[PDB]
Symmetry: C3
Subunit: 90 residues, 3 copies
């Protein structure tokens, strides 16, 4: 058989691109490891802090929108409507 | 499922990959929303500024190449050749 | 004139997904050139250094481990576990 061996392979490729998303997260790590501004070396000590920073990195977004349990976010959500109205008049 | 249903199924995955380019705009929002590099911020109001940022986002890249008009870009393009010539020099 | 053309097309579908990864490199350029924060451009002269930045960009990650003399990399590996070790305990 050829289709089956090559077919599952495509499914693996599909899995492969799902893997690519971590690179977005990697870029945050890259900022510190790769020096955000035009990179044209001590920060590795701080870079290891990214191990724990992985938990906090995803937490900043989760807590920024909601802050506390799924309830406080209702207050933050109103800001989105208010911002277009407020910005509408520079 | 059969190869026919799976054939297009593989094709959808092909569509899935292009979606990732759009994620790059998300990373700008994400890092700002994440405070900064390995954080282990008031700017959230500023993050929402990125809402209108869709217009400005293409403008930073668009204005960098030409700057102001769209004919000047021919002049700006010459700059890149000078960089390699100048940087290659002692 | 269907599955045969499509089977190789499937092969091409695999290659193109990996092509997308260079954009992560583009994101570094975009970060500074497109404004790391909600961009809602004289710095281009400085951004030009990012052109040669390609050589430096890969080296920050590679050179961080050893810094100087590959032998030094052996000592770096040990301290890396130590950092996590310190974090592991109160």
């Amino acid at each position: 058989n050829w289709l089956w061996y090559i077919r599952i392979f495509i499914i693996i490729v599909g899995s492969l691109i799902g893997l690519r998303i971590v690179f977005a997260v990697l870029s945050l790590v890259n900022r510190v490891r790769q020096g955000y501004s035009p990179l044209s070396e001590r920060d590795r000590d701080r870079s290891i802090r990214l191990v724990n920073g992985s938990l906090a990195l995803i937490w900043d977004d989760l807590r920024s929108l909601s802050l506390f349990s799924y309830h406080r976010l209702r207050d933050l959500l109103l800001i989105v409507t208010r911002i277009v109205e407020l910005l509408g008049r520079r």
